[PDB]
Amino acid sequence: VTKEQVEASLTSKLKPIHLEVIDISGGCGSSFEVEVVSEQFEGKRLLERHRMVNAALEEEMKEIHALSIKKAQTPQQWKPP
């Protein structure tokens, strides 16, 4: 698994307006932190947002050692009025 693969998967499934993916394992591609801002989270509680992120990363999750979902936000939470 690579950061580009994690990025492309999230981008494909969640169409985020803001996305950050960081390999925190020293370039090993085995631990990632993600920040995902998507309109698809609107009206969804945290558990469902995580389910959506996990489902997007279904193949990656099989291999990697850690996935830290730092932010799963609507655009309005990301940038308040």
Smallest gap from residue 2 Cβ to its own copies (A): 11
d(CA 22, CA 62) in angstroms, rounded, equals 18
Residue closer to its own copies by CB (options 19, 64) is 64
Sign of the C-alpha dihedral computed for residues 19, 27, 69 and 57 taken in this order: positive
Distances in whole angstroms, Cα of residue 48 to Cα of each of 31, 41, 54, 55: 22, 8, 10, 10
Interface pattern 41-70 for its own copies (x via CB under 8 A): ----------------------x-------
For the segment 14-33, give every residue that binds its own copies (CB under 8 A): 25-30
* Interacting residue ranges for its own copies, rule: CB under 8 A: 25-30, 63
